[PDB]
RNA sequence: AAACUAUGCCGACUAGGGAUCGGGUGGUGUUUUUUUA
């Protein structure tokens, strides 16, 4: 039963970054918040909920 | 050293051979 | 990598990184020069001189110990060959094969090897003629 | 940067850049002290910064080698660890404002994470397809080795319960290990 | 037929990139190779690269972060005028703003954008994207 | 022998006088080392500071006599350090720019040898130049690496990092 | 394993200690 | 085994690709310039 | 409003035709190109060989 | 896996002379006492000549394919 | 006289495994052996 119920992927955040993601930072005080940055120079703040 | 020596290699040697040739 | 052969060997000497004389070497530079002159007077070629000094006299490299190559040391003292040492041996080998082909006219293998040797002489002779080490009129045999 | 969030509805802006700190050289890593505002950046030199000051308040560096990553401890907040390009791991203590210990490994380590439940234990992502679990007080020996990956391990993280770690690798996989076992229980 | 040292280095980097290697050894080195790699480094296509002196041509160890699609040298080293640069890029690169064409100019080896900024020109060395 | 004899410079500085007095004292005390100490003579000297607060004595010497100094450099260096503590004594020759810089480096590291040289190019554009030395006298040179860096920076105007591989420092 | 048959002095190194080249402060 | 290898996507047309490098003809250079 | 297919991007790169400019040239009007998740997913599955196609497809002008 | 930039000293020892990071010679030099007069002579490890004592004219080594085999009774030390 | 059932994607190209031929270095202990070589 463990094998047939193994469905780990839940989803992706938004449309992702234009270029590869090389920096991820979690908010240690908030459960659903995240920060990511890419080689494009762009940084985003997410609502994982 | 005697077996590894060359009779005709240096400029002085061939001149010596030329001297004896004539 | 061999020209005129299919071998790809890489056997060679690996000159040490440091270019100063060994610490344990405690002989005067002038003494090494006199030893080089003596051996050249006896008839030894520059390649053979380096072997004797390196094997028995601790001279790791003539340039490192004395600051000048064996060829330049000898030329400074009046000792210089007719023709470059590598060309000297190629010609001698060609002579020996030609002598053998004289007695044995059925040795087609020796005929093939002679072509390779004479070809090496022409390429090597042409280089030395370009650099002016060899007089322009010089021709093999 | 400052970001407007909707966690609470007790109000009802200034969303954007707040301050900029200029540096002499390029930066390569950043991490922030948990208890207080000070944060540390790792570039050609690892620098301790204060938020209320535009220049690095303190300069830390074992030597001339550059620092590629750093991570503040989570329980003993004054302890910090960094990684060098010379295949080294350096430990710092802010109470002394100095480095403490250095060990050189056979290959570079790309990331460090401290155990949330154990103040003196940290795991390192290494480039020999392995992740190494270390004790701060005795760095001569590793506590554990994780060997399942087949390319460089580029990041590592502890679960907040402290019983698991997750590794990201150059081989396009994510592996989860139990801290008491040297082999992965999962691959994604 | 042997190939130029620059071409050998670039082919080695491409092969190491494609095969998934995170480090490549390049021998022999040169000033041209180091400048070319420095342009790459400034644009982030490679990581740190270290030069080792062996009292010979030398060696370089280059770290790769997987962001390199392709690099190469272009011959003959034809001269490109400043006004022509844009057109040449449109011929030599995947897209309008994708990749950099590297030129050896009177001011040194530099990408096409910095050459435009400096109003300099010269021969073409190669391309990276 | 007078100290001024050791000094090739016509107008000797006071520090030259002191160190030349040291050499002639070594000559007189030496029962046979004087035979090699007497011919040896030096052009000048430079006292140049080090990061730690110390200074180093760069004794500028002619190259043909630099060879003879290198023959007897060890004993002279130890004795001069005894006479002059807080002083790191080093014998350098006065002498293309790359070649002379390399020769200056070799003179500095003497009696130790250079195992290798490396240049690390960082991402931002910085360069770290490093010189790898052997482990022949690892403790002594480890007490002198910073002095070598300071001296080389002062003379050649370059930033170099002296490393001793096979040991973690 | 073949080496240890004839090698008089071949020490046993644990997998945990293999990655460390050295440390600065010895204890 | 019968399937041909996937050859990726074409990215250039200016000149031929060889081991020595990308070669651009004299005619092309004049045409572009 | 134009729906982009996966092969369209690949052939556009082969011919050096910009998506936004190429469409304006063809129709002489403002075109709003659109990429669906399926097309984006198909580009990602093509592999590392088509990383260039993936980066152009992510241009901000492509909604 | 190995770090090309920082190879282990043990790994470099096993490699070929020309394949290390910085190629170097694996040979060395020796101080050989002649059994006869006890004078010391410098000998190359891979000597290609039968090095003879200058004073004694006594053979100290014999050339071989690789390392020269020292004559019996000649004591030696690595210089 | 000769051929007469064959067949293998290719390359500038990564890391390997077992066996074997020639050379070299080191370890080890059995064959070997002793101031005739
Ligand atoms: Mg041959
Ligand atoms: Zn759909
Ligand atoms: Zn004797």
Task: Answer yes or no: are the C-beta atoms of F102 and F129 closer than 8 Å.
Answer: no
Residues less than 5 Å from ion ligand 2, measured at CB: I 36, 38
Q: What is the dihedral of CA J66, J67, J70, J72, to 10 degrees?
A: -70
| Residue J67 contacts strand K, CB under 7 A | yes
CA–CA gap between residue D113 and residue D36 (Å, rounded): 19
Q: What is the dihedral of CA E87, E92, E96, E102, to 10 degrees?
A: -90
CB atoms within 10 A of CB D177: 24
Instruction: Give the DSSP per-residue string, A1-49.
Output: -TTTT--------TT--SS-EEEEEE-TT-SSEEEEEETTS-EEEEE--
State both tokens at F48. 């140049």
How remote is the CA of residue J63 from the centroid of ligand 3, in Å? 19
Cis peptide before A19 (omega within 30 of 0): no
F99: three-class secondary structure by DSSP: helix
Say if D35 is an interface residue toward chain A (CB within 8 Å). no
| Residue H17 contacts strand K, CB under 7 A | yes
| Residue J66 contacts strand K, CB under 7 A | yes
| Domains annotated on chain J, with CATH | 1-79 (2.20.25.100)
CA–CA gap between residue F21 and residue F14 (Å, rounded): 11
Phi, psi dihedral angles at F27 (to 5 degrees): -60, -50
Cα dist from I45 to D154, I41, I48, I49, I56, whole Å: 23, 6, 9, 10, 15
Q: I29-38 long-range contacts, Cβ below 8 Å, gap at least 24?
A: I31/I1, I31/I2, I32/I1, I32/I2, I32/I63, I33/I2, I33/I4, I33/I61, I33/I62, I33/I63, I34/I1, I34/I2, I34/I3, I34/I4, I34/I62, I34/I63, I35/I4, I35/I62, I35/I63, I36/I3
E124: three-class secondary structure by DSSP: strand
Structural domain boundaries in chain F: 3-166
| Residue E11 contacts strand K, CB under 7 A | yes
8 Å CB contact of B9 and C39 = no
CB atoms within 10 A of CB G9: 4
Q: J43-49 long-range contacts, Cβ below 8 Å, gap at least 24?
A: J43/C55, J43/C56, J43/J68, J43/J70, J43/J76, J44/C54, J44/C55, J44/C56, J44/J68, J47/C55, J47/C56, J48/C51, J48/C55, J49/C51, J49/C52, J49/C55, J49/C56
CA–CA gap between residue H10 and residue I25 (Å, rounded): 23
What's the CATH fold of domain C81-141? Helix Hairpins (1.10.287)
Nearest CA-CA partner of D180 in D144, D136, D147:
D144
| Angle formed at CA E92 by CA E90 and CA E93, multiple of 5 degrees | 75
| Domains annotated on chain E, with CATH | 1-68 (3.30.1370.30), 69-129 (3.30.1490.10)
How remote is the CA of residue D110 from the centroid of ligand 2, in Å? 38
CA diameter of chain E: 43
List D residues 92-111 in contact with J (Cβ-Cβ < 8 A): 106-108
Name the DSSP letter for residue I5: P
Nearest nucleotide from residue G9 CA, by C1' atom: K27
Say if F165 is an interface residue toward chain C (CB within 8 Å). no
Nearest nucleotide from residue E16 CA, by C1' atom: K14
Q: I1-5 long-range contacts, Cβ below 8 Å, gap at least 24?
A: I1/I31, I1/I32, I1/I34, I2/I31, I2/I32, I2/I33, I2/I34, I3/I34, I3/I36, I4/I33, I4/I34, I4/I35, I4/I39, I4/I57, I4/I62, I5/I39
Task: Answer yes or no: are the C-beta atoms of E99 and E127 closer than 8 Å.
Answer: yes
CA–CA gap between residue J54 and residue J41 (Å, rounded): 9
CA diameter of chain B: 29
Name the DSSP letter for residue B6: -
CA–CA gap between residue A41 and residue A21 (Å, rounded): 10
Task: Answer yes or no: are the C-beta atoms of C113 and C97 closer than 8 Å.
Answer: yes
C1: three-class secondary structure by DSSP: coil
Question: With left for phi above 0 and alpha for psi between -120 and 50, is residue D10 left, alpha or beta?
Answer: alpha
| Angle formed at CA D132 by CA D131 and CA D135, multiple of 5 degrees | 155
Which three-class secondary structure string do you get for D140-159?
CCEEEEECCCCCCEEEEEEC
How remote is the CA of residue J32 from the centroid of ligand 3, in Å? 10
I2: three-class secondary structure by DSSP: strand
CA–CA gap between residue I54 and residue I46 (Å, rounded): 9
| Residue J65 contacts strand K, CB under 7 A | yes
Phi, psi dihedral angles at D95 (to 5 degrees): -60, -30
| Angle formed at CA F166 by CA C23 and CA F152, multiple of 5 degrees | 65
8 Å CB contact of C18 and F114 = yes
Closest ligand to the CA of J38: 3
CA–CA gap between residue J8 and residue I53 (Å, rounded): 42
Q: For residue C18, what is the nearest residue in chain E, using CA coordinates?
A: E55
Structural domain boundaries in chain C: 26-80, 81-141
H/E stretch holding E50: strand E49-53
PDB experimental method: cryo-EM
């Amino acid at each position: 039963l463990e094998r047939m119920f193994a469905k780990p992927f839940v989803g992706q955040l938004g449309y992702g970054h234009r270029d590869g993601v090389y920096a991820i930072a979690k908010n240690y005080g908030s459960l659903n918040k995240l920060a990511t940055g890419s080689a494009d120079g762009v940084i985003k703040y997410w609502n994982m909920s | 050293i005697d077996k590894k020596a060359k009779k005709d290699f240096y400029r002085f040697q061939v001149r010596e051979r030329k001297k004896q040739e004539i | 990598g061999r020209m005129h052969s299919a071998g790809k060997g890489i056997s060679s000497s690996a000159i040490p990184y440091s270019r100063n004389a060994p610490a344990w070497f405690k002989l005067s530079s002038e003494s090494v020069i006199e030893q080089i002159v003596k051996y050249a007077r006896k008839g030894l070629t520059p390649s053979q001189i380096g072997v004797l000094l390196r094997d028995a006299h601790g001279v790791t490299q003539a340039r490192v110990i004395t600051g000048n190559k064996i060829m330049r040391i000898l030329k400074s003292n009046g000792l210089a060959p007719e023709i470059p040492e590598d060309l000297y041996y190629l010609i001698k080998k060609a002579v020996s094969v030609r002598k053998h082909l004289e007695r044995n006219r059925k040795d087609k293998d020796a005929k093939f090897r002679l072509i390779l040797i004479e070809s090496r002489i022409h390429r090597l002779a042409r280089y030395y003629r370009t650099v002016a080490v060899l007089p322009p009129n010089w021709k093999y045999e | 940067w400052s970001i407007n969030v909707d966690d609470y509805s007790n109000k009802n802006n200034e969303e954007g850049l707040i301050r900029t700190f200029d540096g002499e050289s390029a930066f390569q890593g950043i991490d922030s002290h948990r208890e207080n505002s000070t944060f540390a950046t790792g570039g050609a030199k690892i620098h301790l910064w204060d938020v209320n000051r535009l220049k690095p308040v303190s300069d830390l560096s074992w030597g001339a080698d550059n620092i590629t990553s750093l991570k503040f401890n989570q329980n003993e907040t004054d302890i910090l660890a960094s990684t060098g390009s010379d295949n080294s791991i350096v430990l710092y203590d802010l109470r002394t404002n100095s480095p403490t210990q250095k060990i050189v490994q056979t290959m570079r380590t790309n990331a460090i994470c401290w155990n949330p439940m154990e103040a003196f234990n940290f795991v390192t992502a290494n480039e020999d397809h392995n992740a190494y679990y270390y004790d701060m007080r005795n760095l001569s020996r590793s506590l554990n080795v994780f060997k399942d990956h087949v390319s460089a391990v580029m990041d590592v993280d502890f679960s907040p319960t402290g019983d698991e770690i997750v590794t990201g690798s150059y081989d396009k996989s994510i592996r989860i290990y139990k801290t008491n076992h040297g082999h992965s229980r999962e691959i994604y | 037929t042997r190939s130029s040292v620059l071409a050998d280095a670039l082919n080695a980097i491409n092969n190491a990139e494609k095969t998934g290697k995170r480090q490549v050894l390049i021998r022999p080195s040169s000033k041209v190779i180091i400048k070319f790699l420095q342009v790459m480094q400034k644009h982030g296509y490679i990581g740190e690269f270290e030069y080792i002196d062996d009292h010979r041509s030398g060696k370089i160890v280059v770290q790769l972060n997987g962001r390199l699609n392709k690099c190469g040298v272009i011959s003959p080293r034809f001269n490109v005028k400043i006004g022509d640069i844009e057109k040449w890029t449109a011929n030599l690169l995947p897209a309008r703003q994708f990749g950099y064409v590297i030129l050896t100019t009177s001011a040194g080896i530099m990408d096409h954008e910095e050459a435009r900024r400096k109003h300099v020109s010269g021969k073409i060395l190669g391309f990276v994207y | 022998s007078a100290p001024q004899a050791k000094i090739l410079s016509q107008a000797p500085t006071e520090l030259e006088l002191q160190v030349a007095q040291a050499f002639v004292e070594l000559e007189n005390s030496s029962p046979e080392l004087k035979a090699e100490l007497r011919p040896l003579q030096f052009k000048s000297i430079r006292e140049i500071d080090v990061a730690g607060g110390k200074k180093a004595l760069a004794i500028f010497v002619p190259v043909p006599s630099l060879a003879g100094f290198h023959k007897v450099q060890t004993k002279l260096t130890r004795e001069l350090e005894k006479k002059f503590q807080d002083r790191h004594v080093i014998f350098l020759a006065e002498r293309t720019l790359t070649a002379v810089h390399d020769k200056i480096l070799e003179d500095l590291v003497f009696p130790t040898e250079i195992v290798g040289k490396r240049v690390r190019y960082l991402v931002g554009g910085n360069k770290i130049q490093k010189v790898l030395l052997d482990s022949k006298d690892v403790q002594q040179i480890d007490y002198k690496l910073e002095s070598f860096q300071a001296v080389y920076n002062k003379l050649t105007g370059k930033q170099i990092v002296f490393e001793i591989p096979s040991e973690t420092h | 394993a073949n080496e240890r048959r004839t090698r008089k002095d071949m020490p046993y190194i644990s997998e945990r200690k293999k990655q460390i080249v050295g440390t600065v402060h010895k204890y | 085994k019968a399937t041909k290898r996937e050859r990726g996507l074409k990215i250039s047309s200016v000149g031929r690709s060889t081991r020595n490098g990308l070669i651009v003809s004299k005619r092309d250079i004049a045409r572009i310039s | 409003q134009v729906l982009i297919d996966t092969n369209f991007i690949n052939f556009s790169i082969q011919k050096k035709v910009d998506i936004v400019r190429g469409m304006m040239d063809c129709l002489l009007a403002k075109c709003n190109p659109l990429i669906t998740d399926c097309v984006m997913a198909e580009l990602e599955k093509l592999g590392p060989k088509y990383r260039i196609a993936l980066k152009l497809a992510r241009d901000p002008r492509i909604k | 896996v190995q770090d090309l930039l920082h190879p282990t000293a043990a790994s470099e020892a096993r490699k070929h002379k020309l394949k290390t990071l910085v190629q170097g010679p694996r040979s060395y030099f020796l101080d050989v006492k002649c059994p006869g007069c006890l004078n010391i002579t410098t000998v190359f490890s891979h000597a290609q000549t039968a090095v003879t004592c200058e004073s004694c004219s006594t053979i100290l080594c014999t050339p071989t394919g690789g390392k020269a085999k020292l004559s019996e009774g000649t004591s030696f030390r690595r210089k």
